[PDB]
Design a protein around this ligand. Structure first.
Ligand SMILES: [Cl-]
Ligand SMILES: [Cl-]
Ligand SMILES: [Cl-]
Ligand SMILES: [Cl-]
Lengths: 152, 156
């Protein structure tokens, strides 16, 4: 089914408002129940599995870190039911700032978020052979895992 | 007055794919043709000494990467927004000759007046660097571009 750019924008903005408000019910309503949030490998212990887990993690972040998130850019593709968000995570209580971007997939039937894959404005970690999302099934999802180029 | 051109989704996709082709082909001319001359590529602070200023510089530096690292890039997801004339790309940078893989995502802005890329802002699937107060893009004028600089929870 069709999902408009405006409908996706509304879900995304409601979600980030829910984050900033530490309002779990509000956040949960923006996702299909089994939604998964992925992050760079070596973060949060791995993926957040389920809308309730995602919401609890963000509530905890606000309470512990004083987290506040801004939507700095929002790219929405109504043809593919996907979006990308450039964001800032202000860890207020620590006087720290983390910026990044994330890809968002919607479930067309419900018009809700089914997956988020986040990336950071953080330099490549030294000595790590594979810098990719933690717990993400790259091979099963059809991503290349080995370079197409013949090694020198 | 003026009317901002609406670029088609196909047009934006064509430029992006030509760009990535040019990257893999180490073809500076092909890459340069995908950008306005003054285009800037941003990266996480600490990477590549800062931003790449100008199409010719982006092209030269990726040509160097192919030659020295065996770099090969793939487009893993492509999100195109004809309302804003912007795109986002989930990508993989295979540093072939080092047997290393770096994945990430980037925001791409188009110049509507030419149909070419004016800016790329790239982010990585790399963990947060320890003890760095601000993890943000190198050389990017957050303040001047209207981005928040300090937490909205702090009175302003
Ligand atoms: Cl493969
Ligand atoms: Cl179109
Ligand atoms: Cl500010
Ligand atoms: Cl701050």
């Amino acid at each position: 089914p069709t999902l408009s750019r405006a409908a996706m924008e509304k879900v995304i903005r409601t979600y980030y408002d829910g984050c900033n408000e530490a309002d779990e019910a509000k956040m949960i309503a923006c996702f299909v129940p089994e939604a998964v949030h992925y992050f760079p490998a070596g973060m949060y212990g791995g993926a957040f599995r389920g809308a309730a887990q995602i919401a609890h993690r963000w509530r905890t972040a606000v309470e512990t870190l004083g987290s506040y998130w801004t939507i700095d850019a929002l790219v929405i593709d109504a043809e593919t039911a996907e979006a990308a968000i450039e964001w800032t995570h202000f860890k207020t209580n620590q006087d720290k700032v983390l910026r990044g971007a994330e890809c968002v997939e919607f479930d067309r039937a419900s018009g809700l978020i089914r997956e988020i894959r986040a990336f950071y404005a953080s330099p490549q970690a030294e000595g790590i052979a594979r810098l990719e999302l933690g717990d993400f099934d790259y091979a099963g999802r059809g991503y290349r895992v080995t370079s197409p180029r013949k090694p020198a």
